[PDB]
């Protein structure tokens, strides 16, 4: 995380682009000069932007730093950003029993409702001879329990030297979800 | 004075509930524990943080921090020799009351006798 707090007296870079408490641009200067300014004005130094090649810092009072932090948390509480998609992995066997496949199928369903990405890998069972066409049938069994909830983000693809298959599942987008409801309603009207 | 042991252990004839529940018999062994090395800690940090403070203020230019730099080197030189001095005294037992090897030879001559002969 990157926090909006006083950077301190130690500035990482030698050349620092500085701004005033009122927003006035003070230009680029050495960190030593910035330290003198902080003591002269009795203000603290904050980092406004880091992406810029010349590091951009601003002088601010303790109260001002708080007011900015209050603004930011309201911006998030009101308009929360989606979090990064978490990838959940499962490694199955070709000869997996049907009770254990239902257990892991129910687990995949809970991951899709949370809008995660589920990477499902299927390996050849121990002391078992299986074809890639049979291993690929398990994916359809897993995805058949989720008719209008999940779809293939990445389709089954041999990996690990052809020993195992691997697919990625995802939750249907809002547009894809309304399409499923539409198609389902058309079938209802037909029937 | 050693704490009392009368009526402290669960035994026939002792009405009260046990005060102590030793996992090992309370009988003196014929040996003492081995000298447990003290956890190590970083030293000379005070001088190290004065040198690095000058570097921070002088753009890591050694020309301005000669006095502090030499001070840090002296602390390490003194501390480096302290490694040799302590080790020599630790083996000699100059600071120890007695060495576990020396203290165990003395107990070998007067072994605890928890049995009848």
């Amino acid at each position: 995380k990157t926090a909006f707090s006083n950077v301190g007296r130690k500035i990482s870079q030698r050349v620092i682009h500085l701004f005033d408490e009122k927003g006035n641009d003070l230009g680029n200067m050495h960190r030593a000069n910035v330290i003198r300014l902080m003591d002269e004005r009795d203000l603290r130094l904050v980092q406004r932007n880091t992406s810029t090649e010349p590091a951009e810092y601003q002088l601010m009072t303790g109260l001002q730093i708080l007011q900015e932090r209050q603004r930011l948390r309201e911006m998030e509480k009101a308009n929360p950003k989606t979090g990064p998609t978490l990838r959940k992995e499962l490694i199955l066997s070709s000869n997996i029993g049907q009770h254990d496949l239902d257990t892991k199928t129910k687990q995949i369903q809970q991951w899709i409702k949370k809008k995660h990405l589920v990477q499902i890998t299927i390996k050849k069972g121990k002391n078992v001879d299986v074809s890639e066409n049979e291993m690929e049938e398990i994916f359809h069994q897993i995805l058949q329990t989720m008719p209008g909830i999940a779809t293939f983000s990445s389709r089954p693809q041999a990996v690990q030297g052809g020993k195992a298959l691997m697919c990625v599942l995802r939750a249907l987008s809002k547009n894809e979800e309304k399409a499923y409801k539409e198609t389902q309603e058309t079938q209802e009207r037909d029937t | 004075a050693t704490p009392s042991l009368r009526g402290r252990l669960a035994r026939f004839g002792n009405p009260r509930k046990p005060v102590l529940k030793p996992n090992k018999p309370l009988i003196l062994a014929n040996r003492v524990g081995e000298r447990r090395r003290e956890k190590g800690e970083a030293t000379c940090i005070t001088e190290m943080s004065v040198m690095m403070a000058c570097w921070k203020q002088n753009e890591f230019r050694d020309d301005a921090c000669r006095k502090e730099i030499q001070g840090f080197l002296d602390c390490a030189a003194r501390a480096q020799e302290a490694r040799k001095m302590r080790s020599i005294q630790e083996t000699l037992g100059e600071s120890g009351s007695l060495l576990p090897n020396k203290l165990n030879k003395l107990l070998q001559r007067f072994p605890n006798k928890p049995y009848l002969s």
Partner: protein, 208 residues
Amino acid sequence: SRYSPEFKDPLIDKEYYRKPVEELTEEEKYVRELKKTQLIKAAPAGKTSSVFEDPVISKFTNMMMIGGNKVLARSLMIQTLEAVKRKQFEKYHAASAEEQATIERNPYTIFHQALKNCEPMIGLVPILKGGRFYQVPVPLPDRRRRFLAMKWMITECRDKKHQRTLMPEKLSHKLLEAFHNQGPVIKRKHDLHKMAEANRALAHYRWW
């Protein structure tokens, strides 16, 4: 080793031997009567009693030696010292009488001061605490500081960035840069010091 543990290393120093007896202490008198009974190793074929012998340059030469080719390593060293001296004689004649006083023309003085300006005062060694290794600012022994200054100078000159420049011209140029507290070898020292400073909070992880 083909020398039994009884063999002591030779002391090659004419002054140590001509020193009068009266100046000697009772401890120094005992060491001298003792060595008369000890076995002495043959003098290595590197160091001699010459007045032009410099152990630092001899060591720097060995760190430049590839596959036991001392003749070539020595040739590069003596070619570097001549290149340093000629560059300073050129800067000397082209300068004013006032600037001339500040210009050093001895390549041995430049060589030593160039290396001393690159020695890193503090180091970073991995330290295990709580089952995790941590890089930690640590003091460096005097031997280690000298070695790193040499290894950094030789490494920089062997960098492929230099295109078709001969080693005596590369090394001569880098020594004069470091002699003036400039160049990439000094920057490498500042980087190690900056890395040590940014890991100041991790100093406690050290146990010595």
